[PDB]
Design a protein around this nucleic acid. Sequence first.
DNA 1: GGAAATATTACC
DNA 2: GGTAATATTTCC
Lengths: 53, 26
Amino acid sequence: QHGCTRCGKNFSSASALQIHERTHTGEKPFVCNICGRAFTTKGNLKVHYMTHG
Amino acid sequence: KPFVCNICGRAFTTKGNLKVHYMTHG
DNA sequence: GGAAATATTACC
DNA sequence: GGTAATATTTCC
Ligand SMILES: [Zn+2]
Ligand SMILES: [Zn+2]
Ligand SMILES: [Zn+2]
C-alpha cells in the first residue's frame, strides 16, 4: 500500500506513487524535443512523439 | 490487438483486456 | 521485487 | 485525436 498524502489514492508501488504525485507538483520531466511539450511520464511523451511523424 | 469487441468494435492486445472491457456494455 | 513500459481508460 | 492518469504487464 503506497498512499498519496495529498489525496487518499493508493498505488501499486513507490514509483507509481511517484508518477502520481506529479499530478500535484506539476513536475513534468519528459519534454518533447520537437515541440517542447512536457509530460509527467515517458510513456505519454513516447505516444505524443508519434503525433509528429 | 487481435481481440475484437463485437459490440463496439474496439481491438485489444489480449483476451483478458477484451473480457474486462465487455463488462462496460452490460 | 519494484522500476519501467505498456495498455487502457476518461475526458473532450 | 491526443492528453492525463493508472492498471496491468513486462523486464532486469
Ligand atoms: Zn495524490
Ligand atoms: Zn511534440
Ligand atoms: Zn466494446
